[PDB]
Amino acid sequence: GAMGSMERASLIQKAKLAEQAERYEDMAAFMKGAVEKGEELSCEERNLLSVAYKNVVGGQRAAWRVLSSIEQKSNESEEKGPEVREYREKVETELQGVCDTVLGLLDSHLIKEAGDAESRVFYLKMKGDYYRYLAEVATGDDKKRIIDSARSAYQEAMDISKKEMPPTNPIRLGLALNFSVFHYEIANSPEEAISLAKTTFDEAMADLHTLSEDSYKDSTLIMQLLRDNLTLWT
């Protein structure tokens, strides 16, 4: 695309500058350019890709929720015309476009080249996340298939992570956290969400003794998110 003429290393360097400048749309465009060079991503590069798109889609999701709430209030009320629905639809279409972009990068060809557990689980978790973001706005005949696509990606990531990673590994923990959110918020399965969060927390607790001080801090930060959700849910 528009980044085709820029060196891979320059795209990565500029993605890091864009992060420091809080220019997340630029960061995402730079990281998409880097992915499209066709080489596998290092751990740091995968995390830059994730940070960029998480911030872009996060702003869209927050906006969509504001607009959807106004739209639902409008239907409880004075008729204000088509504008709320139109603008919610525009934000929704842009959100779906970003999710499709991320899913396209994963399918062409990040996942198929990812052989190590750390990279494969990272990408499958991302696939689950972006289908989950599509599911948050889905209302039509494909909602069930979108939900199943998220579930399937998360499940494959879970299966690999349980075989290949220790229970404190931050990728494994973040995957379990997000899959538990999927169960609670998308799949109407709060008991599954609670069970997954509890088991994940307890198995990580039992493995903390193996960790360095720095790894301990990384793992316990995510465990606290699991605990925070459990406190909300129970």
Added chain:
Amino acid sequence: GAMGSMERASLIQKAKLAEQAERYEDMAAFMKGAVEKGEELSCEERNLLSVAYKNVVGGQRAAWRVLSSIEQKSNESEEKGPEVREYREKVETELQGVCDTVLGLLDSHLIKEAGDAESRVFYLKMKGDYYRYLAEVATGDDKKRIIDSARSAYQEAMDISKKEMPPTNPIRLGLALNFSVFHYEIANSPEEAISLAKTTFDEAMADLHTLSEDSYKDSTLIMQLLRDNLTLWT
């Protein structure tokens, strides 16, 4: 432009939705569409226009300052190639483009149709502000002319505001505040900045007794910004 097919009232309605959703680029595009309908703007509409572009250019200015600081550190140091300069230049070009868009709306034809003091001062202050934002990044042979354009717009706004508005009027206060910032940060005139802020504050203080409770709150909020700058500067 792209908003030419949308009703003026729908653009305004969507600008307000975009504000609630914190979608300031959309808000600016909607308000540009509204201006391009060719009718004068009401007070509320002028403020929507200002909020939209202030947030857009504010993100660009914050990013430019981050990148400029990294660039200057790079020149004090290991040579990291052209990427920092390139990316600072890209943000700078986008910032200049937004300022040119705002200045173009003011010149075609908001200012020439603005006959009331409240609208004319508002637009001339905005002209000063956006030339000031151009001046923050200017380094070439036109920097002096950019600075003089800001000064001239602010000065005309000041002359009208002193003749036509009470010293507590929030537009007059915000204009004096921004002109004082221009003197301090752009024109290398800290004494003029301090004198203007002091005189503005004192003349507003003497006029507060004329105000309703609500107008008092509006005026004293801006007076506090003048005082905050004076505390920093003295």
Added chain:
Amino acid sequence: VRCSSMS
């Protein structure tokens, strides 16, 4: 409030 996914 609302539950949180990975930061």
Added chain:
Amino acid sequence: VRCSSMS
């Protein structure tokens, strides 16, 4: 810090 313009 840095001075502030109108909010």
